[PDB]
């Protein structure tokens, strides 16, 4: 294929578009880029390990990868205390070396390997219009994805377990012996409203549900992989979809935008797959923690926190949710759907329980609430912690803030890319992506509007 | 041929005075619903307890507001992020008191504007155009989504969505600055560059085209009549415009390719607005503007003020007064 504008029709700034029909070069680009991803995983892990002070919390040190490893149950014990630093190092080293291998392969295919693969092999050669081959590649990758989900399941069940922040006796790494395979729970998660108090799938709150849903995901992905290997797209799919490389790219871009938004919300709200031990409190958690901290302090001072009415007439410390549940008062009324391992022991069937509040509060809960209140996910861009009017002496931005902001931004720009490529794929399939033909300008053959 | 096929040809018809299309089949109902509810509420909605402290705020004209002060008030802080449709209220009066109209209008409006963007793509496809006008429109859509949905989601309440009113908009902005220092956020600076530069480039482009108009009229009639709709020839001399501009600054800073020029005109404000929309969307997660409070110390250790410290003083002044009865505890975390 050509490597300039005259021979390709694409400028340098759209040079990767020149690869659309060079399957070998495209494969090289993909493999090298995968090498970039794995390289970042390894290098960032080693950086985080090197810059890790293991007696300080992870979320106080700007770490986003080490929490992922800790959640999987590696190198941590009860309450998230880092037992062994070596497994983090091993994850990083393995990713770095494998990235070397992937980069070598991507360079080979991009620079010297065969330009196209179709006259080399039918198995690896593909045509974008070859619907059966495209569904074959879908099938292979679906099988792989289901296998990866089952790898998560195997780690949680047979290889030491995963970190369970809801464990009795304290959050700890525990082995999940009874995943919920019950499809009612698993698929009723997908039907929950994406609004406050329901939290469509962000509300999954126990590792049994997570592991069981991953068993279901693995089975679904593998069976769909086989289904796509053994069939071709049906008539309705053929009549509804654009069948081109750019169209498939646009479809994947839409999917990725959806996943990016979901991940940003997930890290912002969920404290089960993102234990606060490693990611710090959620904003909801920190607000509730402040309310709890001052309930505890004022109660020790002698305030009768059940009957103390605030300035507006609502309870200063306790109040009712619009459905009647007893909740913390103040602005944190909006966060009454929050559930956390440190707060549920004080919750009764009706909400917060006066008897537990008056005699069941443990010193570790007070310490945890103070920590979470002071590590609220508020911070400046230059990493000054606290409310924006605070002064420069607290260097902290929550990992939840970093992850949520970054992935909302990436989700948005991938929605933009999906719009761009979907529109372009449609126009190119219909053949007017290069502009209006003067001879057959469609609007010239149309009746005037009025 | 078939009834469904006939309906399809009608909806996707390019001969309709207003294109409907499949995105239009969602846009029209949702936008009409939002408009009717907005007008009704703006005129006649009763006061809304936005802060969830039984402190209702009058937003409608009939309850003492003018056009500037009137608004559709965001739903109650007690609701938070809960879905509050009409059928979850004990009565219409309860729904009104808790700010249900805001949720109805906002949700329908958001669906409508996303469908408007899809409809722009659809009509471009039906007319044989290039497909990317909707990409430009995605910038205002991103900004509106940031202020009506994303920011309330990150903050955890639709009470922290932008009110549907003029003064409500100003209140939103002032509180936002107090809590996030949006002025000192580089994405908002990029938004300001986007709009200032977009207006600048609009003024230059319009003035350079108007300046280089080919003489086709007399001094009496409007020069606008020198252009005939659908004429093939060019109505201005782009070469003269390039000569003027390349001598105003220097030759190589002036576009002589109209296509590159118009791409630049499209791209600058759109990119700026994308950046500012992302700025609001990320300040939704309290990743705030720069904090240089007490960044400059003298040798002894006393703080030397900068303009950032004066700005922080203004922010604190806004911060301590806003929602004066809503806070019970020392830190404004919610």
């Amino acid at each position: 294929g050509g490597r300039d504008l005259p021979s390709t029709g694409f400028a340098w700034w759209s040079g990767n578009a020149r690869l659309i029909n060079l399957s070998g070069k495209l494969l090289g680009a993909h493999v090298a880029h995968a090498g970039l991803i794995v390289f970042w995983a390894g290098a960032m892990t080693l950086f985080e390990v090197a810059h890790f002070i293991p007696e300080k919390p992870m979320y106080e040190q700007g770490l986003i990868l080490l929490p992922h490893i800790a959640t999987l149950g590696w190198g941590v014990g009860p309450a998230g205390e880092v037992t062994d630093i070596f497994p983090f190092f091993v994850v990083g080293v393995l990713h770095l070396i494998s990235s070397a291998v992937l980069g070598l392969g991507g360079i080979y295919h991009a620079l010297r390997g065969p330009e196209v693969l179709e006259e080399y092999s039918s198995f690896f050669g593909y045509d974008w219009k070859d619907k059966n081959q495209m569904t074959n590649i879908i099938g292979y990758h679906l099988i792989l994805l289901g296998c990866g989900a089952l790898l998560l399941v195997f780690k949680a069940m047979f290889f030491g377990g995963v970190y369970d922040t809801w464990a009795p006796g304290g959050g700890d790494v525990r082995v999940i012996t009874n995943p919920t395979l019950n499809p009612a729970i698993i698929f009723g998660y997908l039907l929950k409203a994406p609004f406050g108090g329901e939290g469509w799938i962000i509300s999954v709150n126990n590792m049994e549900d997570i592991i069981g849903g991953h068993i279901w995901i693995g089975l679904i992905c593998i069976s769909g992989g086989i289904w796509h290997i053994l069939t071709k797209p049906f008539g309705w799919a053929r009549r509804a979809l654009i069948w081109s490389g750019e169209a498939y790219l646009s479809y994947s871009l839409g999917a990725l935008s959806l996943m990016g938004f979901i991940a940003s919300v997930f890290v912002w709200f969920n404290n089960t797959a993102y234990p606060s031990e490693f990611y710090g409190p959620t904003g909801m958690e920190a607000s509730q923690s402040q309310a709890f901290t001052f309930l505890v302090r004022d109660q020790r001072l002698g305030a009768n926190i059940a009957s103390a009415q605030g300035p507006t007439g609502l309870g200063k410390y306790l109040m009712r949710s619009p459905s009647g549940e007893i909740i913390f008062g103040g602005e944190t009324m909006r966060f009454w759907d929050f559930r956390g391992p440190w707060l549920e022991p004080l919750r009764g069937p009706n909400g917060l329980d006066l008897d537990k509040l008056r005699n069941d509060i443990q010193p570790w809960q007070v310490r945890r609430a103070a920590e979470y209140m002071t590590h609220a996910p508020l911070g400046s861009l230059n990493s000054v912690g606290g409310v924006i009017t605070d002064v420069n002496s607290f260097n902290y931005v929550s990992p939840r803030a970093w992850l949520a902001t970054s992935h909302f931004v990436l989700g948005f720009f991938f929605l933009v890319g999906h719009l761009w490529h979907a529109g372009r794929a449609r126009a190119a399939a219909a053949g007017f992506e290069k502009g209006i033909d003067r001879e057959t300008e469609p609007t010239l053959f149309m009746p005037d509007l009025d | 041929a078939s009834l469904w096929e006939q309906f399809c040809q009608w909806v996707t018809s390019t001969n309709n005075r207003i294109y409907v299309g499949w995105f239009g089949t969602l846009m029209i109902p949702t936008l009409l619903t939002a408009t009717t509810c907005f007008i009704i509420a703006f005129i006649a909605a009763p006061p809304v307890d936005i802060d969830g402290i039984r402190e209702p705020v009058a937003g409608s004209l009939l309850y003492g507001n003018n056009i500037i002060s009137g608004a559709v008030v965001p739903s109650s802080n007690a609701i938070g992020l809960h879905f509050y449709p009409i059928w979850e209220a004990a009565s219409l009066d309860e729904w009104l008191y808790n700010g249900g109209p805001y949720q109805l209008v906002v949700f329908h409006f958001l669906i409508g504007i996303f469908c408007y963007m899809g409809r722009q793509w659809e009509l471009s496809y039906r007319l044989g155009m290039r497909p990317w006008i909707c990409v430009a429109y995605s910038a205002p859509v991103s900004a509106a989504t940031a202020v009506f949905l994303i920011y309330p989601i990150g903050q955890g309440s639709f009470s922290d969505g932008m009110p549907l009113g003029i003064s409500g908009t100003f209140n939103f902005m002032i509180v936002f600055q107090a809590e996030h220092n949006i002025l000192m956020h580089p994405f908002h600076m990029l938004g300001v560059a986007g709009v200032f530069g977009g207006s600048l480039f609009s003024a230059m482009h319009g003035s350079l085209v108007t300046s280089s108009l080919v003489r086709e009229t007399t001094e009496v009639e409007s020069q606008n009549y020198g252009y005939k709709f659908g004429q093939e020839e060019e109505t201005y001399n782009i070469v003269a415009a390039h000569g003027y501009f390349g001598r105003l600054i220097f030759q190589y800073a002036s576009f002589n390719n109209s296509r590159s020029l118009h791409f630049f005109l499209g791209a600058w404000p759109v990119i700026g607005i994308w950046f500012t929309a992302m700025g609001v969307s990320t300040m939704a997660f309290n990743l705030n503007g720069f904090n240089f409070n007490q960044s400059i110390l003298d040798s002894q250790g006393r703080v030397i003020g900068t303009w950032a410290d004066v700005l922080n003083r203004a922010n604190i002044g806004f911060e301590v007064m806003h929602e004066r009865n809503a806070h019970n505890f020392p830190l404004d975390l919610a």
């Binding site: 005037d448 509007l449 009025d450 | 005129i43 004209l61 009939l62 003018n66 056009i67 005939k228 709709f229 659908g230």
Partner: peptide
């Protein structure tokens, strides 16, 4: 009664919109 004035001006703007769309001067190619 200033509500009447506000409603009046808003309705004037909306009526202008409907007439400007429905009864616009048709663009004609000539």
């Amino acid at each position: 009664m200033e509500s009447v004035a506000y409603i009046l001006v808003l309705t004037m703007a909306l009526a202008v919109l409907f007439f400007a769309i429905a009864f616009r001067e048709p663009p004609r190619i000539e």
